[PDB]
Design a protein around this ligand. Sequence first.
Ligand SMILES: Nc1ncnc2c1ncn2[C@@H]1O[C@H](CSCC[C@H](N)C(=O)O)[C@@H](O)[C@H]1O
Length: 315
Amino acid sequence: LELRLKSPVGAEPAVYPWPLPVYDKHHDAAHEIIETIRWVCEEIPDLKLAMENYVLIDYDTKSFESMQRLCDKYNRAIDSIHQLWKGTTQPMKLNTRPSTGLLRHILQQVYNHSVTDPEKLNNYEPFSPEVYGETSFDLVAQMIDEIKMTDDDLFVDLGSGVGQVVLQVAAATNCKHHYGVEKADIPAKYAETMDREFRKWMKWYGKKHAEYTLERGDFLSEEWRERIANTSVIFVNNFAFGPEVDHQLKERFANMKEGGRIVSSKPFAPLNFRINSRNLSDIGTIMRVVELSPVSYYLHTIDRTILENYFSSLK
Ligand SMILES: Nc1ncnc2c1ncn2[C@@H]1O[C@H](CSCC[C@H](N)C(=O)O)[C@@H](O)[C@H]1O
């Protein structure tokens, strides 16, 4: 007893067992299935012509025969489109990145299949750097929209949790490599399933992502000092890290190259910082800081021009 969804690009079919799993109050797998079908129809205009006669909202999510008919209608449309491509028509171009709406659906799908008990994420020690909170898809999308990233960039999420910031950026951008590093056992374990589910689903949709790695580790380790130094774009949700960890992070950031960037939920230097004789050791001497469009996040850019100009002025 299963439901199967053929891949538009001919990857292995997505197979669901029946009954379908319960996710939470607001989401179940039957509606994920319907939304997947709707999204593939967005992905492939010709699929709409084949599917346009069926009213999706009219099926019965609680009935197996009803959902199996829906899946079979979709699979037959996929076959028909595949025959169209065998003829004069040109197949869908591979290597494309997903549209933002599709990517939001993919990550929700990856998350719901991956994090089985989301309440375990709340089991952290309070008032410690392990306090867990998730940056929303929208904030990450706004960051991707507000900062340039190219194949010359290396992206790191420090304290990557279950890894969904890394996946989103890897799907949306050209960075040479994307990484995230998570110390705590519970999010790091989930991130292994997230990694697996993401590669499977992206292949099933026929969408491309840049290269990425989700690692278990401690970003304060001796090995991570050099890796931070060599990173062009750092994302860190430091909201709960506290002064000692933020101070350790400032020391690492101080080895970054000119033009290196840090996006954080709490600023590492004041926005108004004015360099003078008293503050010369502050990290504000080496970086510009601006608030991203407002929950506020901050973009820091390594600029030693600030410190260099203060010394030239003393002469
Ligand atoms: N020294 C350290 N090394 C690796 N991860 C750390 C760390 N200190 C704290 N963390 C992790 O940082 C995470 C912050 S919650 C942020 C999760 C994710 N990046 C997001 O923004 O959605 C927590 O999961 C915590 O375990």
